Amino acid sequence: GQQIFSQALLNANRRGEAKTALAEVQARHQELLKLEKSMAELTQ
Amino acid sequence: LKSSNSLRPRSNAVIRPDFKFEDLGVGGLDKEFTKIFRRAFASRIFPPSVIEKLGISHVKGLLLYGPPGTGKTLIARKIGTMLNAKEPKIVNGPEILSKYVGSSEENIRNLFKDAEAEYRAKGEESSLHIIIFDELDSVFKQRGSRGDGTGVGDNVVNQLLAKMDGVDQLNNILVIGMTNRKDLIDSALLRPGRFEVQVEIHLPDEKGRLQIFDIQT
Amino acid sequence: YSGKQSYLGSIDIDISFRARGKAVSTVFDQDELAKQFVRCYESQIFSPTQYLIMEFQGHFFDLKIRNVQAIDLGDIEPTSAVATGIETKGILTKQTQINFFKGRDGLVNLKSSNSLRPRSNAVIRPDFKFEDLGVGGLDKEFTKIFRRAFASRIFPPSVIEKLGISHVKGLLLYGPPGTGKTLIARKIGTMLNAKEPKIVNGPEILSKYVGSSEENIRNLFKDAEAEYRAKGEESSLHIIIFDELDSVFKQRGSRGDGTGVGDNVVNQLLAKMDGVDQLNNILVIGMTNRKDLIDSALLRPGRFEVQVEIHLPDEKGRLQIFDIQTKKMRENNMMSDDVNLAELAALTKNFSGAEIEGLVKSASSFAINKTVNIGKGATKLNTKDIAKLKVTREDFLNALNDVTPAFGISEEDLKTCVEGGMMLYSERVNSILKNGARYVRQVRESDKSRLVSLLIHGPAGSGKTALAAEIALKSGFPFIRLISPNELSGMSESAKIAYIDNTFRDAYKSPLNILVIDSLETLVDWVPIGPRFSNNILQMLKVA
Amino acid sequence: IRPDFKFEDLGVGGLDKEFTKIFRAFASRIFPPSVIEKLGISHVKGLLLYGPPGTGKTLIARKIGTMLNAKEPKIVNGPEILSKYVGSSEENIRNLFKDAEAEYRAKGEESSLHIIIFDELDSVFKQRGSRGDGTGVGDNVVNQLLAKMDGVDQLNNILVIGMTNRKDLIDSALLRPGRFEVQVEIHLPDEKGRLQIFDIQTKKMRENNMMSDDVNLAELAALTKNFSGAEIEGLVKSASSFAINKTVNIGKGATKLNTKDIAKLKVTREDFLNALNDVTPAFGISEEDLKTCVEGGMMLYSERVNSILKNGARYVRQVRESDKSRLVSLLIHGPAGSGKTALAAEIALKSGFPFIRLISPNELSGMSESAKIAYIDNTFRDAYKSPLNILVIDSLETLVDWVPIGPRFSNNILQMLKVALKRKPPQDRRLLIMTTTSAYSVLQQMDILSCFDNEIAVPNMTNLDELNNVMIESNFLDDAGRVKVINELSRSCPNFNVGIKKTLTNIETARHDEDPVNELVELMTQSA
Numbered sequence A: 001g002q003q004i005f006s007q008a009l010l011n012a013n014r015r016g017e018a019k020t021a022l023a024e025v026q027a028r029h030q031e032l033l034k035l036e037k038s039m040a041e042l043t044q
Numbered sequence B: 001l002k003s004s005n006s007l008r009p010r011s012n013a014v015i016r017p018d019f020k021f022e023d024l025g026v027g028g029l030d031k032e033f034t035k036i037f038r039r040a041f042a043s044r045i046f047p048p049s050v051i052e053k054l055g056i057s058h059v060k061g062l063l064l065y066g067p068p069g070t071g072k073t074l075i076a077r078k079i080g081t082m083l084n085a086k087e088p089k090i091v092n093g094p095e096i097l098s099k100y101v102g103s104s105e106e107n108i109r110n111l112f113k114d115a116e117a118e119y120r121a122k123g124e125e126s127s128l129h130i131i132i133f134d135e136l137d138s139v140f141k142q143r144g145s146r147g148d149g150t151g152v153g154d155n156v157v158n159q160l161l162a163k164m165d166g167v168d169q170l171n172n173i174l175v176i177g178m179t180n181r182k183d184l185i186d187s188a189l190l191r192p193g194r195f196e197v198q199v200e201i202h203l204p205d206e207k208g209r210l211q212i213f214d215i216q217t
Numbered sequence C: 001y002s003g004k005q006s007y008l009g010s011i012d013i014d015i016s017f018r019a020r021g022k023a024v025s026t027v028f029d030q031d032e033l034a035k036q037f038v039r040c041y042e043s044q045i046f047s048p049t050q051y052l053i054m055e056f057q058g059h060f061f062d063l064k065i066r067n068v069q070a071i072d073l074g075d076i077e078p079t080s081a082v083a084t085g086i087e088t089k090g091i092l093t094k095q096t097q098i099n100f101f102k103g104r105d106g107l108v109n110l111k112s113s114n115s116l117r118p119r120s121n122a123v124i125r126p127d128f129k130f131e132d133l134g135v136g137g138l139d140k141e142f143t144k145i146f147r148r149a150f151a152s153r154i155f156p157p158s159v160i161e162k163l164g165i166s167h168v169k170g171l172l173l174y175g176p177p178g179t180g181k182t183l184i185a186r187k188i189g190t191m192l193n194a195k196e197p198k199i200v201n202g203p204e205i206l207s208k209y210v211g212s213s214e215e216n217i218r219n220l221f222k223d224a225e226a227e228y229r230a231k232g233e234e235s236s237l238h239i240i241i242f243d244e245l246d247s248v249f250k251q252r253g254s255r256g257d258g259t260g261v262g263d264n265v266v267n268q269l270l271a272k273m274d275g276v277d278q279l280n281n282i283l284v285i286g287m288t289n290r291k292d293l294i295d296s297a298l299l300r301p302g303r304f305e306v307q308v309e310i311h312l313p314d315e316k317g318r319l320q321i322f323d324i325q326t327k328k329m330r331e332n333n334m335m336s337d338d339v340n341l342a343e344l345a346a347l348t349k350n351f352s353g354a355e356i357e358g359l360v361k362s363a364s365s366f367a368i369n370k371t372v373n374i375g376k377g378a379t380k381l382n383t384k385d386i387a388k389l390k391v392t393r394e395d396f397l398n399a400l401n402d403v404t405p406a407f408g409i410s411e412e413d414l415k416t417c418v419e420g421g422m423m424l425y426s427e428r429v430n431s432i433l434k435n436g437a438r439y440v441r442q443v444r445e446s447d448k449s450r451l452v453s454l455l456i457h458g459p460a461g462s463g464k465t466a467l468a469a470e471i472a473l474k475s476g477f478p479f480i481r482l483i484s485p486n487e488l489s490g491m492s493e494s495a496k497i498a499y500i501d502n503t504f505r506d507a508y509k510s511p512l513n514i515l516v517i518d519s520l521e522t523l524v525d526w527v528p529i530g531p532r533f534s535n536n537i538l539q540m541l542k543v544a
Numbered sequence D: 001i002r003p004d005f006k007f008e009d010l011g012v013g014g015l016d017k018e019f020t021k022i023f024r025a026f027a028s029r030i031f032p033p034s035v036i037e038k039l040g041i042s043h044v045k046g047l048l049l050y051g052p053p054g055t056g057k058t059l060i061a062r063k064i065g066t067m068l069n070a071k072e073p074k075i076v077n078g079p080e081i082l083s084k085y086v087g088s089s090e091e092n093i094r095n096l097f098k099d100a101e102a103e104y105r106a107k108g109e110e111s112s113l114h115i116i117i118f119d120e121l122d123s124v125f126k127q128r129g130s131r132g133d134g135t136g137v138g139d140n141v142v143n144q145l146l147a148k149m150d151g152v153d154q155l156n157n158i159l160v161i162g163m164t165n166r167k168d169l170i171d172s173a174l175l176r177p178g179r180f181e182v183q184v185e186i187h188l189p190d191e192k193g194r195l196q197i198f199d200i201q202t203k204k205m206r207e208n209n210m211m212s213d214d215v216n217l218a219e220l221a222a223l224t225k226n227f228s229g230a231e232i233e234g235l236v237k238s239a240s241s242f243a244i245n246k247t248v249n250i251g252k253g254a255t256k257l258n259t260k261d262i263a264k265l266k267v268t269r270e271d272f273l274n275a276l277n278d279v280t281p282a283f284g285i286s287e288e289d290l291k292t293c294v295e296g297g298m299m300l301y302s303e304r305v306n307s308i309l310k311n312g313a314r315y316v317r318q319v320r321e322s323d324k325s326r327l328v329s330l331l332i333h334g335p336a337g338s339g340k341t342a343l344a345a346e347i348a349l350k351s352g353f354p355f356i357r358l359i360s361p362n363e364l365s366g367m368s369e370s371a372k373i374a375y376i377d378n379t380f381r382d383a384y385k386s387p388l389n390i391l392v393i394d395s396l397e398t399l400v401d402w403v404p405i406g407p408r409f410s411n412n413i414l415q416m417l418k419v420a421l422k423r424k425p426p427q428d429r430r431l432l433i434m435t436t437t438s439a440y441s442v443l444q445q446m447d448i449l450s451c452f453d454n455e456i457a458v459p460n461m462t463n464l465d466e467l468n469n470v471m472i473e474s475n476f477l478d479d480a481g482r483v484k485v486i487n488e489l490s491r492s493c494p495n496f497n498v499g500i501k502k503t504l505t506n507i508e509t510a511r512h513d514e515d516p517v518n519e520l521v522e523l524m525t526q527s528a
């Protein structure tokens, strides 16, 4: 005669140590503006 | 369409006056039908002009109780599926409760938001919403009576109280409840504003029995 | 053009600074500015939104007259409404109450200097009446609530800072269902010229992940502290309402869940309401049906000081409620002239506040059904029918058969006790009835005789109980109740003790009360064979 | 510690002894270090402050940082230590000690003292010796503290202070030598401390001439027998709310400010009385009970009452004076309704001892047997603390449930009472116990009569003169009326025996109905 709940711990703390996903997310942005500038030059 | 100067009935009417009690197919029970259609649905046929000129909100609750095997589910279903409204969100009895610390209460909350959003968006022209609880008397018990070392018997009732009639109004929902025993339902749910019309459904009289035979064959 | 309103009474001016790189830190005196404004610019006509260049000690400004008051000579008080319309104009005088508020740029360090004037944003809106809230009855509780709570926020800051005091920051409303305790919170939220309330339904704070619940309960105060650190006192009031407090904040120490979540939220709220840091600009509303499960620490002063009880209304309140609810009908001429509200208020003895509206609904339903005749005789709708709709008294009388009280369930026994009728076959009955009425008079008029007991005895079958009910019913007291074996049947002994005890505790509310006990002998389990009988109940009655 | 300081200069009133005890914490660190190692004594590292809600602890914790030189104790509330991530909460605790640790390891013993304070400690440090088998974070956290707390590795410049409302919850594993050694209980203020709390709270009030000279603080302190400091500022602000609300008429009308009267705003004594009427302590004892028992009041209708009262005075003097009489018990018996409880209440109230209590069936109402046993024991236990104590027991027969059919009654309560009435209190306490009853013969017969030192009879009144006295006191009728009634009663029924309570009842009934003889005399005659 007993019941219990449970609480999760989210972990995935390798990502969580940083903001969350910055491996191919923030770097992609970094190099994608570079693509934009080079294409601007190519079209110019 | 548009409402002409002539006070003609609502464009997207709900009940459609080409309607008859012998279309349902429920024999016996006759006066109860009169009661329910008088009290609940009548307000929603007239032009909204006059009904707003009465400054009165529609009923937002229905309860059916009786002995086992009498026809309650039939009523619930038929009302469910011959009106001009969106598909009802059925829920079985102990279907809300969940494992994690806060998933049950969120499951209560999931039920209403679409009506809330539609009401916010447009207002009084929103199509009616229906949600029907089956077999109320499993979880919604008198608060603070059961020891409930598992503290769920309070919070579910608490949520439903807070959200059926809370600081924000909402007047486009109709909730229908079913049970065999009202004596254990909490008292705070049976006041006007929440489950106004309560109806007993009893064993049939003889003429009703004739009616039922006529229906079945 | 104006006719009479030819003067400028009180002028509120948003004083922007001209050039924002020049922003002068030296403190600006509203009195000097007002005197200069009058002296330089006298007997001029000004209208709202007229902009002006003010060179005061070389420090230019862009005055905008945000608002103007137009008054006629001979008005002792400025009862004329401050008009924002450009049409209203006046002639400036040496008596003009010149109020400066900071410009749109907010750059000007204006002072109140003995300016016994309403606050910059006095929340409670200086002209305001209880009659506009729309709540019938409870004409005393508002006095308490506003006096204790909001009386201190309006009064000019210097003198309160002298009074060296901190505003209250808590308010609790508790009572039985349907008494109207949600309406107050809502209209207080909506009518007070503050920030929007941050509604939270009762157990909204619990969350799956560990440490997210407490986060949620300390995510509510962020803007208040944010404003307080910046603007200090002149922050506008923030209000957050907890709906139905009693779900989560139980007395810490029980075994509620088996996880230990309730204790944490309790801890967080406790630490934050008073805490180490000072907020002094926040207000919280509580609501509940039980006051006894809230953890004790919450109720200490400094957190949830004022507690207010909401109880059922008396007859005057009932009349007020019928007035409010049936307000629009009357002015829209949708109601027959035959109904008089007084008799309605008389009939509904134990109706709560929340039942009257249902009565209105049912009466309307009868009237409207009379037209449509749902089912068989359909399609009779037409302009003529709907063009003369009026509710009738008999509709209300019919409606009384659908709605039923919830607290007035025991007097029904009393009226049915005399279904056998009453007959005056003997003189004796009249004497007895008169004597009972005499005693009723004595208790009603007296002040020091606060308790009287009677006993009625005689042969079995002599018709005793009916006479007792007949005495009781004619009294007209607010509170009547009956205890009889029929109620206690089937219970367990302890339950009997608890029920009787609760009934006596529930008889100490109203000023005047009448209580009837039927057949003590059967209540105490008398059988002569032993004899045997249950002693504890006997004791309970004797002591009580 | 700053030299620019003395203990007077801060607002904490009443708690002076506790200040001395806690200071007596910092004494070890006043001297140069060299002494202490030569004296072979370690410093205390853990502190606990605790008391009932609303005693002032948070004010001490906030304000102490001023006295305690260097820079600042760090502050944290319990439930912010826990965290979302695995191992983040574990980290968080063991991040705080870093600064002090670093400085210490570098500088040796020159280290400036570091203080850290956990407000609301009980949030997370429940017994690690517990179960429920959720995620075990609630254990790991406390482990961490203990590791950094016990095996400090010579970190000897840290003082942890724990603030709580409820001591018992906390792990027994924190309450041992070397870790939270001293536990200081802060309890409700005395009357002097109550005065100082008024002093500090009404300081600013008093300087700038906002308070009427009519007010005299001492009597206010005298009245407010049962209040927390929190309650006291609550009362102050209630009073001010009254005082302010006379100019601004809230609700009715608009905001009507008499700008002149604003300068003349002044609180007054009656405001304070209303403010008292509003607030109510959870202190709870509410011994005003005594006065409601004697609400009918005493009129001294005869000499017998006077003699009895003098005897009571003799006994209270006796117990107060002698040291060998540490326990005295008395019985008061007489006919029913003669009026006995009131007389005991009179003696008790006149006594003026520090501690008084009454036991009546009324509070005992509604419990089960075992609960009654517990209650009785608890109240006795409580009574044993103060040096001088008065305790009254009311209507023993009702307490013991005597009904004559069986006769049925509960033996266990009787045994409890019999045993307790003979027990001398602990050393250097004295006690005076006063029991009343109305059915002496039963008391004889079950044979507990040997436990009472002396007995007092209280016969009811019988002579018409005394009736004249009480009725002149009640102002029933005019003088000729009060004479004629007694003259008529002299011959109507000279032999006379009623009591007192019934006389008052008849007087009121006749006053309402028909104050001529024809009712009042009739009712006495039927009763008599």
Ligand SMILES: Nc1ncnc2c1ncn2[C@@H]1O[C@H](COP(=O)(O)OP(=O)(O)OP(=O)(O)O)[C@@H](O)[C@H]1O
Binding pocket: B025, B026, B027, B028, B029, B067, B068, B069, B070, B071, B072, B073, B074, B075, B180, B212, B215
């Ligand atoms: N009044 C009725 N008219 C026609 N059919 C009926 C009526 N009452 C019951 N029935 C028949 O009985 C069947 C079962 O009825 P139903 O499921 O409503 O029972 P119930 O009252 O919900 O029972 P329970 O309390 O056990 O859940 C229906 O499929 C229907 O055909």
Ligand SMILES: Nc1ncnc2c1ncn2[C@@H]1O[C@H](COP(=O)(O)OP(=O)(O)OP(=O)(O)O)[C@@H](O)[C@H]1O
Binding pocket: B165, B188, B193, C134, C135, C136, C137, C176, C177, C178, C179, C180, C181, C182, C183, C184, C289, C321, C324, C352, C353, C354, C357
């Ligand atoms: N005294 C009253 N004055 C005005 N309207 C009232 C009054 N009493 C009831 N009403 C009307 O009926 C409603 C009464 O219930 P309300 O919505 O206030 O919830 P409540 O009584 O606080 O409910 P609960 O405590 O059961 O949650 C009001 O919102 C209002 O519409």
Ligand SMILES: Nc1ncnc2c1ncn2[C@@H]1O[C@H](COP(=O)(O)OP(=O)(O)OP(=O)(O)O)[C@@H](O)[C@H]1O
Binding pocket: C417, C418, C419, C420, C421, C422, C423, C424, C459, C460, C461, C462, C463, C464, C465, C466, C467
């Ligand atoms: N003049 C009357 N006085 C009393 N009762 C009357 C009179 N005329 C008719 N009656 C009916 O007779 C009934 C007699 O039953 P009632 O319970 O009053 O009697 P009772 O002697 O107290 O009952 P019981 O035998 O159960 O102890 C009354 O309830 C009432 O309905």
Ligand SMILES: Nc1ncnc2c1ncn2[C@@H]1O[C@H](COP(=O)(O)OP(=O)(O)OP(=O)(O)O)[C@@H](O)[C@H]1O
Binding pocket: D293, D294, D295, D296, D297, D298, D299, D300, D301, D305, D335, D336, D337, D338, D339, D340, D341, D342, D343, D438, D500, D501
């Ligand atoms: N001089 C007096 N002596 C006694 N009682 C007095 C006197 N003056 C007034 N009274 C009132 O007479 C009443 C007698 O006391 P009380 O009512 O407690 O009676 P009691 O005999 O102790 O009670 P009980 O009959 O229930 O055992 C009280 O109301 C008391 O205030």
Ligand SMILES: Nc1ncnc2c1ncn2[C@@H]1O[C@H](COP(=O)(O)OP(=O)(O)O)[C@@H](O)[C@H]1O
Binding pocket: C297, C301, C302, D011, D012, D013, D052, D053, D054, D055, D056, D057, D058, D059, D165, D197, D200, D228, D229, D230, D233
């Ligand atoms: N001299 C004093 N003695 C006791 N309390 C005081 C004194 N001065 C102020 N107070 C009030 O005591 C309260 C302390 O509350 P506290 O006991 O810390 O709450 P909790 O027990 O919940 O932590 C504050 O509201 C404070 O204003």
